[PDB]
Amino acid sequence: EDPHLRNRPGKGHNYIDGMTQEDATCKPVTYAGACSSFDVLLEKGKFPLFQSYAHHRTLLEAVHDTIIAKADPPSCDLQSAHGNPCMKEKLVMKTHCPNDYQSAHYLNNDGKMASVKCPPKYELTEDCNFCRQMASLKKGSYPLQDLFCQSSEDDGSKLKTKMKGVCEVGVQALKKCDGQLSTAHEVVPFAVFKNSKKVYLDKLDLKTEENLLPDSFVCFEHKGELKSFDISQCPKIGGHGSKKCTGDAAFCSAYECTAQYANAYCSHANGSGIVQIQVSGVWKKPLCVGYERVVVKRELS
Amino acid sequence: DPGCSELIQASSRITTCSTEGVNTKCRLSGTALIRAGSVGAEACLMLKGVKEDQTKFLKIKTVSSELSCREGQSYWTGSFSPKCLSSRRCHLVGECHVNRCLSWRDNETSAEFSFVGESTTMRENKCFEQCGGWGCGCFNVNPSCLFVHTYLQSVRKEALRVFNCIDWVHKLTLEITDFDGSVSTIDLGASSSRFTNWGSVSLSLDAEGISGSNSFSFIESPGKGYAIVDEPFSEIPRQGFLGEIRCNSESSVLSAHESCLRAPNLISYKPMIDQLECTTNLIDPFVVFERGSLPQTRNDKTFAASKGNRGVQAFSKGSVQADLTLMFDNFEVDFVGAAVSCDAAFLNLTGCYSCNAGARVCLSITSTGTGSLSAHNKDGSLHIVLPSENGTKDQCQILHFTVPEVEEEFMYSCDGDERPLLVKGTLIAID
Amino acid sequence: FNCIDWVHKLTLEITDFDGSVSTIDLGASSSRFTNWGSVSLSLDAEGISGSNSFSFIESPGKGYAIVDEPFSEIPRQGFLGEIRCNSESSVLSAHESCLRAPNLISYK
């Protein structure tokens, strides 16, 4: 019930490495600023999964926190040479990006991250598979997948696509085809672990496991309402600190509370903590679980 | 474990071949029918690829024969003690009157009890009339009013879920072992279906069922045992019957939620001028829970709690007669064609022949690697498969025979080449 | 009033541990409130059925009485239970909220 959808834990950086153009307004990402790579994540009717899970991290924040690696090149330019590795994974995807956007990032196959790049002044289209010519053009990127990042270091490189009766989904060449193969764009779940491939899913069992973590509390600065305030300036239990801080039982159980003798009010975020996954009957912890609309080839005959 | 008993072969229609160089692998997609075993026995299924050294077993462990109770209508109930609050207001004093105090609605809260506070609890608001004058307080000669605000409060800390069972489903808890080694535990009853790593599984023949269970209600107690009541299920609540105050969840019984259903005019009132005693006559469920606690002698079966999965079951007698239809749903099966060597031994051979239980055998396999060890006889009627490991352990499985004087030379090939093996033992006739 | 069932009430005077002596009662399967918790009745194999054909009359100050006839629900002329009310003021002060049968007053 807490309307803290703009407060980002950790550091609050959303600009990606490759399109560092909107870094003047999204640093740090807080209640202020009009970052094009975060405004569409909270609009009603776009990515409801991130609307349900918004107190954690994103894919960009995971890249900045040394969680999700970047491919080579991390931002494949669309107007340069003749062939780039960041195209076979883009044409198979079918999304809907609004107008006035230059870049569009997505998830690759090797577990890293690869985005596109268009030289000025090129904008996207209704699908984003190709950047054509020309409000003003946003100097950022549009999230092509409905996923969310989180702090995790669970290893899982010995798992592959767990989909039965599927020929070649996305760009992964699984099993061969001998009869009728479909090609309809359907949603498929996936979950990439640490240093692994784009592992798809079939049965998802999400849950909420909260824990007393420093990156699970939100707060706003008080002054003569929601204001930006760094959480790292909160003293510990009898430790030290620069300014002051206070909160409820969750925020005051681990940090020091001074009641009215502070400048903010730290509150525990609803659902923030540890979000595990149940794949192959074994409870695991993913990194950036989400959905995507790629080309699914199912063997009907 | 006494190993597997029924071991058959898969047809060539649901078995394909698709090699990718040296390493020949195949897939399994279709439906195979295998005969289920008895109490203790399993059901293994060996796979033969393009040669003979490739062997993949599919054993299904059978625990016992259970009779799960199919739940239908359920509700949460428990003990409750109302806490009455008296507030004798004088006549013509704020809201206390001769006409407003009598005709008072039970679903309305005016200024007489608005300062108490809102709470999701099955409460009610009454209104009575006592006396006035200077004998008890009041300037007017008219009798004063008496507003009553009584709300329920569960004095206990435990809750019970009273349910019933319209039919007894013969559940068979099966521990299916995959080909790679992922051991999973599932269950099958009557004609159910689950989800495995290699596909799915369902039950075919199930000629074991008991009818006539609608006239009995069950009570679940988290932590303690269960109970049985010799009375049909309670649908509509009424005063003087088991199942008056009911709810829908555990919080509706512990925290007393308003959303619980109850009968109107269930709280009595005995006002005494300045006193109030709002008590009820709710039947204590722990009395019947302690009176009819399981186990109980009912007809000819034994009712008790279940293991692993929460629910009610029953202990019957006899054997296990069912048919298991394995449902292959396109599963990739891989196996290296280069196995390792190993030697086997012999221990004892006791049990029975031509029966559902069979006979166990002790086989000491001494190998140097992790793999399998296929074995057969001469005429082509016995099949033995055991996962070989680097060590010295005792294995063996159920071997059905048709002669008490067991004497047949076995031929095991754990690496591709057959080796002689002689077994012996005396068995008995057990149907 | 009437009585549809006879509840075997057991007036129990429970003595607390500290010394707070309280007097309560238990019937059939009732429950009360004590300083140490609560109390209820388990076994109660003593009950009498068949009391719907008898009506009782309460008199504050004096004794009670019994009537050999069933309870009166609907009022009518020439029957016990014509003019009825809901409280003591409806009988003493004659409140207009009391229910009665129409055309009950004769005129000559």
Distance between CA atoms of B219 and B77, rounded to whole angstroms?
Answer: 10
SS3 assignment, position B411: strand
Spatial distance between the Cα atoms of C44 and C30, rounded to a whole number of angstroms: 11
Option in C37, C42, C88 nearest B287 (CB): C42
- Give the tokens for residue C85: 């009310």
| Residue whose C-alpha is closest to residue A114's, from A188, A5, A250, A19 | A19
CB neighbours of B130 closer than 8 A, spacing ≥ 6?
A: B88, B136, B143, B144, B145, B146, B271, B273
- Centre a 10 Å sphere on the Cβ of residue B66 and count the other Cβ atoms it contains: 21
User: Using a CB-CB distance cutoff of 8 angstroms, which residues of chain C are in contact with residue B240?
Assistant: 5
Q: CB pairs below 8 Å between B and C: how many?
A: 50
- Cα torsion at B197, B202, B208, B214 (round to 10°)? 90
* Cα–Cα distance list, A177 to A165, A298, B26, C23 (Å): 10, 9, 14, 86
Q: Tell whether B155 lies on the interface with C, counting CB pairs under 8 A.
A: yes
- Please give the C-alpha separations between residue B418 and each of A114, B54, B341, in angstroms, as whole numbers: 55, 14, 11
For residue A166, the chain B residue with the least C-alpha distance is: B330
**Tokens read off for B409:** 């030379």
Phi, psi of B167, rounded to the nearest 5 degrees = -160, 150
Beta pairing partners, A288? A149
CB within 8 Å: B282 and C29: yes
Q: Closest-CA residue in chain B for A282?
A: B182
Which residues of chain B are within 8 Å of residue A203 when distances are taken between CB atoms?
195
Closest CA to B49 of B329, B339, B344, B421: B339
**Cβ contact (<8 Å) for B284 and C40?**
yes
B31 contacts chain C (CB < 8 A)? no
Biggest distance spanned by C-alpha atoms of chain C: 73
Q: Which of A37, A52, A190 is nearest to A115 (CA)?
A: A37
d(CA B93, CA B142): 11
b/e map A215-225, b = 16+ CB within 10 Å: bbbbbbbeeee
B331–A176 CB contact, under 8 Å: no
Whether A158 contacts chain B with CB within 8 A? no
Q: Which amino acid is at A141?
A: S
Looking at the partner chain, which of B18, B184, B329 has a beta carbon nearest the beta carbon of A281?
B184
| CA gap B379, B271 in Å, rounded | 94
Q: Which of A170, A166, A143 is nearest to A63 (CA)?
A: A143
- Chain C residue nearest residue B81, CA to CA: C31
The nearest CA of chain B is from the CA of A164 a distance in Å of: 7
CA angle C75, C79, C83 (to 5 degrees): 45
Its sign, for the CA torsion A247, A248, A253, A259, is positive
Whether the link from the prior residue into A243 is cis, omega within 30° of 0, is no
Say if the Cβ atoms of B182 and A280 lie within 8 Å. yes
Contact B102/C88, CB-based, under 8 Å?
no
* Residue linked to tokens 């049965």: A203
Sheet of strand B42-48: strand arrangement = B4-9, B42-48, B55-56
**Residue written as tokens 């039982």?**
A249
The pair phi, psi for residue B89, each rounded to 5°, is: -105, 140
Token pair belonging to B221 = 């107690």
What does the block give as tokens for B67? 């009779």
DSSP B144: P
β-sheet with B342-343: strand ranges across: B342-343, B364-367, B391-394
Which residues have a Cβ under 8 Å from the Cβ of A147 and sit 6 or more positions away?
A49, A50, A59, A107, A288, A289, A290, A291
Torsion angle, alpha carbons of A156, A160, A162, A168, to 10 = 150
The H or E element containing residue B168 is strand B160-169
**Does B103 contact C88 at a Cβ distance shorter than 8 Å?**
no
Task: Say yes or no for a CB contact (<8 Å) between A280 and B197.
Answer: yes
- Distance between CA atoms of residues B228 and B295, nearest Å: 9
Q: Are the C-beta atoms of A256 and A266 separated by less than 8 Å?
A: no
**Are A and B touching by the rule of 3+ CB pairs within 8 Å?**
yes
Separation CA B265–CA B269 (nearest Å): 10
Contact B296, B230 (CB under 8 A): no
Resolution value in angstroms: 13.3
Q: Which residues of A touch B331 (CB under 8 A)?
A: 164
Euclidean distance between CA atoms C76 and B305, whole angstroms: 60
CA atoms within 13 A on the CB side of A51: 10
Cβ neighbours of C26 (radius 10 Å)? 21
Q: Give the minimum alpha-carbon distance from B81 to chain C in angstroms, rounded to a whole number.
A: 7
Of B98, B155, B283, Cβ closest to residue C38 = B155
Helix (H, G, I), strand (E, B) or coil at B287: helix
Q: Are B61 and B5 in contact (CB under 8 A)?
A: no
Are residues A150 and A206 in contact, defined by beta-carbon separation less than 8 angstroms?
no
What are the C-alpha distances in Å from B202 to residues A280, B29, B394? 20, 15, 32
d(CA B425, CA A156): 50
Q: In the beta sheet, which residues pair with residue B220?
A: B161
Between CA B88 and CA A162 the distance in angstroms is 71
Task: State the SS3 of chain A.
Answer: CCCCCCCCCCCCCCCCCCCCCCCCCCCCCCCCCCCHHHHCCCCCCCCHHHHHCCCCECHHHHHHCCCCCCCCCCEEECCCCCCCCCCHHHHCCCCCCCCCEEECEECCCCCCCEEEECCCCCECCCCCCCCECCCCCEEEECCCCEEEECCCCCECCCCCCCCCCECCCCCCCCCCCCCCECCCEEEEEECCCECCCCCECCCCCCCCECCCCHHHEECCECCCCCCCCCHHHCCCCCCCCCCCCCECHHHHHHCCCCCCCCCECEEECCCCCECCEEECCEEECCCEEEEEEEECCEECC
Cα torsion through A277, A279, A285, A286, rounded to 10: -90
Tell me if chain B has a CB within 8 Å of the CB of A281: yes
- The encoded tokens of residue B134 equal 């200077």
Give the CA count within 13 Å in the CB-facing half-sphere of A289: 23
A182 vs A164: CA distance, rounded Å: 14
Strand partners, B336: none
Which amino acid, residue B270? K
Nearest CA to A267 out of A254, A277, A279 is that of A254
CA distance B377 to A243: 83
| H helix or E strand, kind and range, residue B289 | helix B285-291
Tokens of A104: 């569009």
Quick check: bond before A28 cis, omega within 30?
yes
